[PDB]
Design a protein around this nucleic acid. Structure first.
Ligand code: MG
Ligand code: MG
Ligand code: MG
Ligand code: MG
Ligand code: MG
Ligand code: MG
Lengths: 110, 48, 143, 92, 52, 95, 49, 354
RNA sequence: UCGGAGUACAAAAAACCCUCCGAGUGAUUUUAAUCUAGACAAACCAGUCAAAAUAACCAUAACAUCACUUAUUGAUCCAAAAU
């Protein structure tokens, strides 16, 4: 026949944790084919572009201004051609950290 | 005797390492310059 | 016993500067789609207007902690040509001074590749270094 | 520590230097072990620690080598509080 | 063109091997790799030809 | 599986299990990952690690293996020098 | 277990204690057919002993 | 199903029709700037700032200050214009500029700074370190009078206390030299407080050194309420912050209530709330100067607790929370062997009946 | 058999002897380590990410890169190799 091999299963690309959820460090917050959500505060980026939590806490999604890295040719070109008032916005994921960093305890009284 | 032979071999070849990798770095840096000099001496002979 | 001897097991340290000085605090890992890296306790920020040179020391809160500007009368009146390389060096020295006085010895500086090549900034960094302020913050502990 | 005669005087004094942190206001040197559920193993850990301390203190060849990793902050903040300390006028 | 799977050996005297896809019409391969036993970056030179 | 043997009338074990699995005494079975010696040059070091693991089997597999295996293999073993003696009891399990 | 056996007068510490004595107090069970090579002594009750 | 934007959408302003006639920033840098200005405005959508704690956001500041110095705008402006004309006039200066050789007389800049915008910088450093948050709770004052504090480390050695700086307790074993500029109809009160490091009471602090009814710049002439007590952080806890406060008072104030014994080595006796103490005398006292320093445990402090306070010495650790493990499952599936160790109690064999 | 787009309009999944493009690899040097919290995905088998900690290197130096990058692949046993 003419048409062939269109058959492949879904990749289950989606957003795993949602706004307001609790997370433990290392949880995958999302997984994506192209950048849809960008990693924000305390969110690590994997090499497959999936976002995971670096800290125990609460997930939050946010719109924010996008200022690409100057080592990236494409993005700087896209930014450079904008009309003088315009600002790129994107969607970010953060984890607002929950536990305090650590505590001070009384070891021994000398 | 096996352990001492292994350790001997390892010390022996670890003493030879900087000379080897330096020699090979010079070898490759000489190869690159040989090829580039070829390409320039060809570029100038085609230009003329 | 002694009425002084009472302690309580858990010590509350109310001081916000503390865990940073100890290096134990949390930097902000993340972003890394965007730029610059927001991972730091303190960051040196150098803004160059066509007129004035302004060097700020920032906290990730965005709050300016200690700064030196050329609009400032103290610096403006002693020297000449606010936009010069001379001015950058100057501001750097002033800022180093005020930083030591503020108790902050470490900060991160993330310049642009072409700002790193420029003279004014090379000498800003030199002034900052001889001033005793190290760029490149200490690592985190159990990061 | 001062009343312990089974250790020499130079060593008895050098111990009270390095270990002054774990010494007590009553003059006592306190060692502690934790790990095993068996206190034979804890006692043994303590005794081995003590043996080691008396070992390194009785060695005059101990150079007390310090790492730069956690001490970089210490050297630099030291030097940088020394830039300010350098103001010279007599006082009091 | 075909590529080839070569077995590369350490010059650190430690028997250690790793295989690499290498161009058939190219020269004998030599690299700077990591040897785990010596725990160093060392010179590896291709000992053998494994798969074609 | 032979449920009743011909000579003894007992129940036989399937030896093909006993070569690839390991039964801790708790009832957990332990196995190698599949394809861990296969085509190593072609794989990531991360994947290679994931392959070099010893992993646990889900309940279904476990029950299947238990059926395929006689009583002798479920006995409490004390071996001298045994790596796995550490792992044969279960601890802190609230169910 | 050794202490608990001595306390209850199963094995007596007075005469020497070897494998047969442990077996006769039923403090321990050996099955050579399973390649048991004998008893080993472990430290669980060390402090209490 | 669409919803309707609430207020303005960000780029809705510029015209898409005729893009060629619109000016662009062809600079990465201009863009970066514009973006950082956009990142500071109060948007109507969920933002980073909102969740990450701008720390009360907008706050109306109760201000207990000294009134700002009154100076003529136009006069000052003219004088500065002239000074800069003069300085720009010289050829020597220009030579110093082109050839990259020039220096700024840092002492004079420190002088002008102390005179001009210094108070504000010191203020925001104090806000940064949360002096105002633990002292007056809501209140911000601008340090109009400069406060110069120093310690004698030896005969020739002088260790200054600037705002925020680090000092060792060895240096601070003695009462410091204090200097500020006032003529005398004046009366002042100087205060040294340890903002944290109180052992029992999280919300309370220690008064180390409290002096009162201070004529002019004369330090020793004032009657000391609380005798100088050297800094004593505890070994474990890092970096306590000590605060020198200066109050301009009008009427002579006498307090038998706040007066402490002459040796006063009891901790219950020095327990202090700067807020309360200020509430009391609030009518006469107006806080003027400020200088504060960071201080961490060092050797000498051990002598304090034993020798002075007649105490054992408390030592602390930094204790991190135990790592989080999921509920243990009967049949951990496809999990590494070392799984069974995460739920392990302690590493030791235990033979139950055996 | 594997992948991309539509079918399948906005979390996931989703069929057809349905509509369309592809893969069974090149090229390159930056030759891309050990160990381990927590997860994704999932009938099973297989697949995916990944903090901290070690060791390598500037002497606080761990994502190979490009071609739409996604796919360029194959279990046991058994054979050859000797590590
Ligand atoms: Mg499809
Ligand atoms: Mg399908
Ligand atoms: Mg038995
Ligand atoms: Mg004006
Ligand atoms: Mg799932
Ligand atoms: Mg790491």
């Amino acid at each position: 026949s003419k048409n062939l091999g269109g058959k492949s299963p879904g990749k289950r690309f989606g957003i795993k944790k949602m706004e307001g959820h609790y997370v433990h460090a290392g949880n995958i917050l999302a997984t994506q084919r192209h950048f849809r959500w960008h990693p924000g505060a305390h969110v690590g980026l994997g090499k497959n572009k999936c976002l995971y939590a670096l800290e125990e806490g609460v997930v939050r999604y946010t719109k924010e201004v996008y200022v690409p890295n100057p080592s990236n040719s494409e993005a700087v070109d896209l930014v450079t051609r904008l009309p003088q008032g315009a600002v790129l916005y994107k969607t970010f994921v953060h984890v607002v950290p929950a536990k305090p960093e650590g505590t001070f305890k009384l070891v021994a009284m000398l | 005797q096996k352990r001492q032979a292994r350790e001997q071999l390892i010390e022996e070849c670890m003493a030879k390492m900087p000379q080897m990798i330096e020699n090979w770095r010079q070898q490759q840096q000489e190869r690159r310059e040989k090829e580039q000099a070829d390409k320039d001496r060809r570029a100038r002979l085609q230009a003329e | 016993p002694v009425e002084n001897e009472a302690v309580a097991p858990e010590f509350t340290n109310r001081n916000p500067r503390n865990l940073e000085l100890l290096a134990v605090a949390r930097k902000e890992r993340g972003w890394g789609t965007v730029w610059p890296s927001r991972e730091f306790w303190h960051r040196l920020r150098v803004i160059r207007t066509q007129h004035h040179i302004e060097a700020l020391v920032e906290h990730r809160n965005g709050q300016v902690v200690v700064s030196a500007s050329t609009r400032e009368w103290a610096i403006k009146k002693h020297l000449y040509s606010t936009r010069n390389v001379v001015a950058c060096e100057s501001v750097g020295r002033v800022l180093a001074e005020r930083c030591l006085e503020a108790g902050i010895n470490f900060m991160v500086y993330h310049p642009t590749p072409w700002e790193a090549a420029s003279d004014s900034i090379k000498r800003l960094q030199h002034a900052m270094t001889e001033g005793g302020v190290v760029l490149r913050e200490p690592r985190r502990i159990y990061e | 520590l001062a009343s312990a005669d089974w250790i020499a005087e130079p060593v008895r004094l050098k111990l009270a230097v390095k270990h002054k942190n774990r010494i007590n206001r009553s003059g006592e040197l306190i060692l502690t072990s934790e790990c095993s559920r068996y206190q034979f193993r804890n006692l043994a850990d303590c005794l081995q620690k003590l043996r080691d301390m008396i070992a390194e203190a009785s060695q005059p060849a101990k150079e007390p080598s310090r790492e730069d990793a956690e001490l970089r902050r210490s050297r630099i903040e030291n030097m940088n509080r020394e830039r300010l300390r350098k103001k010279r006028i007599s006082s009091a | 063109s075909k590529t080839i799977l070569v077995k590369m050996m350490s010059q650190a005297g430690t028997g250690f091997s790793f295989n690499t896809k290498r161009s058939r019409l190219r020269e004998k391969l030599t690299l700077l790799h990591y040897d785990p036993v010596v725990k160093k970056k060392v010179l590896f030179v291709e000992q053998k030809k494994i798969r074609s | 599986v032979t449920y009743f043997s011909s000579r003894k009338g007992k129940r036989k074990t399937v030896k093909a299990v006993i070569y690839r699995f390991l039964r801790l005494h708790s009832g957990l079975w332990l196995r190698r990952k599949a394809g861990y010696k296969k085509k190593l040059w072609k794989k990531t070091a991360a994947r290679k690690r994931r392959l070099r693991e010893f992993v646990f089997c889900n309940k279904t597999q476990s029950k299947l293996l238990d059926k395929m295996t006689t009583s002798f293999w479920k006995r409490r073993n004390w071996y001298a020098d045994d790596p796995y003696q550490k792992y044969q009891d279960r601890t802190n399990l609230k169910v | 277990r050794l202490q608990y056996l001595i306390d209850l007068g199963r094995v007596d510490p007075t005469q020497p204690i070897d494998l047969t004595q442990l077996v006769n107090g039923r403090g321990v069970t050996i099955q050579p057919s399973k390649r048991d090579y004998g008893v080993q002594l472990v430290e669980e009750g060390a402090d209490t002993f | 199903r669409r919803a309707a934007p609430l207020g303005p959408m960000p780029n809705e302003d510029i015209d898409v029709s005729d893009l060629e006639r619109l000016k662009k920033y062809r600079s990465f840098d201009r863009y970066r700037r514009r973006a950082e200005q956009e990142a500071r405005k109060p948007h109507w959508w969920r933002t980073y700032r909102e969740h990450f704690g701008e720390e009360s956001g907008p706050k109306d500041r109760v201000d207990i200050g000294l009134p700002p110095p009154k100076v003529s705008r136009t006069q000052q402006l003219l004088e500065r214009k002239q000074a800069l004309r003069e300085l720009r006039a010289n050829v020597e200066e220009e030579r110093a500029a082109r050839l990259q050789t020039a220096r700024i007389p840092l002492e004079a800049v420190r002088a002008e700074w102390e005179r001009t915008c210094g108070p504000y910088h010191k203020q925001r450093l104090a806000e940064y370190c949360g002096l105002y948050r633990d002292l007056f709770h809501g209140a911000t004052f601008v340090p109009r009078v400069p406060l110069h504090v120093a310690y004698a480390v030896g005969e020739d050695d002088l260790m200054p206390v600037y705002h925020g700086n680090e000092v060792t307790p060895t240096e601070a074993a003695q009462a410091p030299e204090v200097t500020y500029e006032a003529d005398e109809g004046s009366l002042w009160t100087l205060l040294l407080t340890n903002l944290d490091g109180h052992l029992l009471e999280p919300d309370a602090e220690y008064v180390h050194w409290l002096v009162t009814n201070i004529p002019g710049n004369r330090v020793t002439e004032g009657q000391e309420t609380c005798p100088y007590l050297p800094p004593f952080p505890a070994r474990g806890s890092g970096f306590h912050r000590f605060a020198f406060l200066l109050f301009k008072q009008d009427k002579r104030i006498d307090f038998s209530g706040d007066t402490r014994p002459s040796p006063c080595y009891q901790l219950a006796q020095r327990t202090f709330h700067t807020f309360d103490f200020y509430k009391k005398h609030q009518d006469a006292m107006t806080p003027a100067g400020l200088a504060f320093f960071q201080c961490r445990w060092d050797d000498s402090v051990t002598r304090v607790f034993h020798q002075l306070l007649d105490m054992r010495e408390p030592v602390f650790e930094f204790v991190r929370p135990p790592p989080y493990h999921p509920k243990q499952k009967r049949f951990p599936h496809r999990q590494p062997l070392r799984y069974l160790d995460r739920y392990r109690d302690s590493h030791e064999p235990t033979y139950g009946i055996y």
